[PDB]
């Protein structure tokens, strides 16, 4: 079939404001969008992904943990993940160390991509076009807090987390690997795949 542009696939299959967080994300490190496009590709699905972890999950009354999936939740109701990633450096940090003077959790070295008020932890998140142990052993030896829990997902379903530790229930992840599942087939309809699997 015709090749497309993955300028095209990115402003056509994600959310206008995952786009804008992602070229200003590239800007802030440096990478233009329009040349680094399987990278552009990538930063909007990992946001989306963090974006989708979140999504839904509250703290109740009592103070347990619940799903709330319709667009009204009660006005008591407290969101049970920070979001890190998708802020600029500044703020990132802002909001880390917020939570870390707060939480008494400890300060990591780089910026995580959530906190979990669960399970009192912050938490990397990884999308990967290869093997997930591979992804799994690479950020764990960068950050080493070992604290910070690390729960990747790759297209094709597999996931590897921490301690063999989930996070979250089954729907969740399958929302999130559906997802996935859904952006490597349309950018394998408009034969863009194999060269960003390749890329990463
Ligand atoms: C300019 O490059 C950027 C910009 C913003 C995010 C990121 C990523 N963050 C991750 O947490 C992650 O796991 C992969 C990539 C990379
Ligand atoms: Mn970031
Ligand atoms: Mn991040
Ligand atoms: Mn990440």
Redesign the pocket.
């Known amino acids: 079939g015709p090749l497309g542009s993955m300028e095209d696939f990115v402003r056509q299959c994600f959310n206008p404001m995952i786009v804008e967080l992602?070229e200003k994300?590239?800007k802030?490190?440096?990478?233009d969008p329009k040349i680094?496009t399987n990278?552009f590709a990538?930063?909007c699905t990992?946001?989306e992904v963090?974006f989708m972890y979140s999504d839904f999950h509250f703290i109740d009354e009592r103070g347990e943990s619940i799903i709330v999936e319709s667009g009204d939740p009660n006005a008591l109701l407290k969101h049970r993940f920070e979001i890190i990633?998708?802020r600029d450096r500044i703020m990132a940090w802002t909001v880390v160390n917020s939570i870390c003077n707060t939480t008494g959790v400890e300060k990591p070295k780089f910026?995580?991509?959530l906190y979990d008020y669960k399970e009192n932890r912050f938490i990397?998140?990884?999308?990967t076009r290869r093997e997930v142990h591979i992804y799994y052993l690479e950020?764990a030896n960068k950050i080493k807090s070992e604290k910070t829990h690390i729960h990747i997902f790759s297209f094709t379903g597999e996931e590897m987390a921490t301690k063999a530790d989930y996070t979250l229930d089954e729907e969740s992840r399958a929302r999130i690997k559906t997802r996935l599942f859904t952006i490597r087939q349309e950018m394998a309809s408009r034969s863009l795949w194999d060269s960003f699997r390749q890329s990463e």
């Open positions: 992602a994300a590239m802030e490190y440096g990478e680094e990278k990538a930063i990992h946001l963090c990633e998708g910026l995580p991509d990397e998140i990884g999308v950020k």
